[PDB]
Design a protein around this ligand. Sequence first.
Ligand SMILES: Nc1ncnc2c1ncn2[C@@H]1O[C@H](COP(=O)(O)OP(=O)(O)O)[C@@H](O)[C@H]1O
Ligand SMILES: [Mg+2]
Lengths: 317, 536, 107
Amino acid sequence: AALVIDNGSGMCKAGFAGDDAPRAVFPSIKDSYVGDEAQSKRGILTLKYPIEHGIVTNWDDMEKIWHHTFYNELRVAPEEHPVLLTEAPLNPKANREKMTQIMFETFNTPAMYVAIQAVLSLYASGRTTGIVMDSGDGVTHTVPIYEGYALPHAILRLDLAGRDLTDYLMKITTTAEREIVRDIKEKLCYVALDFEQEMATALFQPSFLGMESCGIHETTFNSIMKCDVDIRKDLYANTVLSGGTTMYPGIADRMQKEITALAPSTMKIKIIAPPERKYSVWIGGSILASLSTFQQMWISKQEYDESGPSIVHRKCF
Amino acid sequence: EGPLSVFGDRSTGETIRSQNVMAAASIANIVKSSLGPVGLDKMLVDDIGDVTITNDGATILKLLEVEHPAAKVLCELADLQDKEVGDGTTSVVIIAAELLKNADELVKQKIHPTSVISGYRLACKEAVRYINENLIVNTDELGRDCLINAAKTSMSSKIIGINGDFFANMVVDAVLAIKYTDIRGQPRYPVNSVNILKAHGRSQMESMLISGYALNCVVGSQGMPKRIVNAKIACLDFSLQKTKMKLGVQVVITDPEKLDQIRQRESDITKERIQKILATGANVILTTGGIDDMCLKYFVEAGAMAVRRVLKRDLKRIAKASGATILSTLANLEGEETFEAAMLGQAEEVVQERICDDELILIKNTKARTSASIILRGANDFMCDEMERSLHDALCVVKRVLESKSVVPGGGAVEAALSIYLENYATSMGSREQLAIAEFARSLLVIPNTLAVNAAQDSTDLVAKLRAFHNEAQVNPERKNLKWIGLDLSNGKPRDNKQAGVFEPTIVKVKSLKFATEAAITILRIDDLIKLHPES
Amino acid sequence: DEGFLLDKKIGVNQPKRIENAKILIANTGMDTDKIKIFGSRVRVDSTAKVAEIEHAEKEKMKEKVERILKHGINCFINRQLIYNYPEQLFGAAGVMAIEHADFAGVE
Ligand SMILES: Nc1ncnc2c1ncn2[C@@H]1O[C@H](COP(=O)(O)OP(=O)(O)O)[C@@H](O)[C@H]1O
Ligand SMILES: [Mg+2]
């Protein structure tokens, strides 16, 4: 089979291909028996999670985690199973070379592949083309995808995530009380089609927060407009949202309306954002690792030995 | 419904009383088959294939998924008996259920529940008094074999029954090892300080009593030694890792020439701490925190044994047992950082021992106190867990025998004597409370009845013989030696259980009666039930 | 009521009865009262200086309480909270410090 380790700036969410749920959610997942079956895990339990804002800070930590998400929470061997790792969109090449050196050299994995988290999210929803708006805890990303691959040239990156969202709400300071504001953020926070008619009975606009770059709907629109005019229909009509940040307000229709406004009066835009399987990236990875085109895309161990960081970078510089 | 309009169901009168009694009876019938030397164990499958074999009534009622409140009450009763005594968790449930049954029979006869409750309370008080005055044996008159007999009685009905002949010795030794005296010079036997480890493999007879301590831990590096003889032990409650500045401290370089030295301290700081420890002579270093590889190398080069992620309770016990001092910091009252050799503990040996493809640590012959560990050895994890539970029951029993030096006979002797005495005593108390006390007496007989039933013998004949013997004892002052008679379930015949060695701590029966009586009273006061529909 | 009633609390170590009461009604901070300069941050190279600055904060609060007491009062009512240190100071001074009255309460 193929181990599908979904880092997803969350937990490890590792398992096997074919499983509808991961089997190794390490971060925040016996005793009185004999052996080292708690101490070895007791060490990892208090180890800081390397990925911050969707980027790996401490690699030794991450490697120790993976090693403990292979030998302890899966009780398997990576020397015979291909691995599908996940990376955040627009992830530096250096991080890719590091993780590929870890897998092929340390864990001696026969073959591996690194997929974009938004692409796997789109896969778990069953589609292969569309523009994914991924807004988590630290970053916001718009990933246009056509034929199942994240077009590396139309990835617009703005920053208005859970933190930036709860910020203005705090404005309306202490950790516990800004987390009361964040509890309200976690709970119902219905998106407003029009803030006028929503405040009458009491990210889209940078000025609201205090930024001066662009809204998320503007971001999606321009990411669609930096693609093929023929696939434009598919991008506009298959916009898939993901991320607990964007889920909390449940923003579908405000986006839809202002994106329709921006787009020509031709393409009909439909946004599918009701899943919330809480393992979308994992299921997308499992689907990919189950396919045979994954064997096609395999960066093999021999390929790695022959090319190195160049094979991880897929040439084409 | 109807006039009330409450959004829920309502049971009222004989209906809800019958329901409560049915629930309690259900819970008691779950566990009735696990009572006495002839009781049998139960499997419990947790809807996922997780299996649990057990004879412990508290365990059984904990694993069950109960919805009725009158049954949750009996589950909590078994839990409370397990917390406060450690044995009697099945008998207490059976007795509470039988008291409920007979008391509901009385309430059907239209004896007011207040009167039944008064009679039950009176009968409980007088049964406690009669036990404390007539049915107790002092363990001083018997010596040490009394403890062994109490342990064997508690271990009978468990998977360490026939081997009790030997397990009791271990149990007794273990409690005697963990004996410690406090202020007022009263001896205290704090079980749960005996460590119990499980390791499938060799037979039960190969289970081990370690005079010292056993740790479910191993050395941190394979280059470290795995045996040390004159063990000087350092118990640390902090981690030995590369030093990280705390939250309110930042490193900001404006002269690159300083960066190197700063990085160097991040490790040299920890090095210095370890050197101080090793400077005192410490050959064994246990820590509740972690130990980086950098530090493990210092321990390796020193010829020391370092252990990380040890448990706080294991550490407290090793410290108390060896003479060491748990340090959360290397910091003294002089504003400096040092480690004194007086903070060390000692032990005649520390080893990394192999046990069925799994290693542990053995600290043997600690000074400043004796400690005790027990490695249970069976055929698989299910048996080992049942052995752990059985041994916990036995240890609690021996502890109770040693704290209060009174025991009572077993085999239904206490229940038979109380049945006789209370059926004679009810004649003086009122007219309806008389019926309540007689029913309390008759209810007490459910224990020998159940023992005989489980033995597959004539319960009626056996319990009648028992009551005859005990009546002879209570009406003929020359025959009080008959009080000690109870059931022999291997032959179906009464027997002098004080001479046979069937002893139970007085506190067991006393607390069983008190808790069962309160539970029955609590359930017997309900005459209505409003079950609301869920808010959703 | 011939007088007035307030559904608020008195401090811990502070009096419970006051005759011929002179009252200071206030809308001050008295709750970790920070200088309204928001870019202000304590940036030092020694925990000793952090402790000195903490002591200075406490001395600022103490001087505030002393300015209050210079009014010659026995009762102090604040619209905002009153934290543990000013509560202790008012208690040591023998002043009844009623806290968390509202805009309506103080009006
Ligand atoms: N060897 C024995 N002979 C006769 N009676 C026994 C013997 N061992 C235990 N009993 C009786 O069985 C009853 C229940 O024992 P057991 O089921 O082991 O404990 P529990 O009731 O706590 O589960 C006790 O009240 C005791 O009187
Ligand atoms: Mg028992």
